[PDB]
Amino acid sequence: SMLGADVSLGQVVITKNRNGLYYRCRVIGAASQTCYEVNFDDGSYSDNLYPESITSRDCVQLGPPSEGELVELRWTDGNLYKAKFISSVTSHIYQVEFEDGSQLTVKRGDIFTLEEELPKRVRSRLSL
Ligand SMILES: [Cl-]
DSSP states (O other), X not given: OOTTOOSOTTOEEEEEOTTSXXXXXXXXXXXXXXXXXXXXXXXXXXXEEOGGGBOSSOHHHHOOOOTTOEEEEEOTTSOEEEEEEEEEEEEEEEEXXXXXXXXXXXXXXXXXXXXXXXOHHHHXXXXX
């Protein structure tokens, strides 16, 4: 959900465009994305797992497993795998529109609000 989001619809923010420059732009859409972080038995992980992928618990109905809980999941190859559940992360993603009417989907970490202090790297590439 948008619970805890720190950017509002209609907010002016700064982000990098397709062309490499940073511009003001307005937020026109907002969404949340919940992914789980699981540790496979070969030592690898995924922090992009769809909650629906968990087959040892109905996570859509019941919410996430407990941290550290052993789970089973169905991967995108259609096969079942054991893993350790680590955490659930809900992140907010925004759609922005630039002056020219072009649009981009942007993760919160790639947005600057107008109050934040901007990197020198960024101030250098900021269009008027
Ligand atoms: Cl693999």
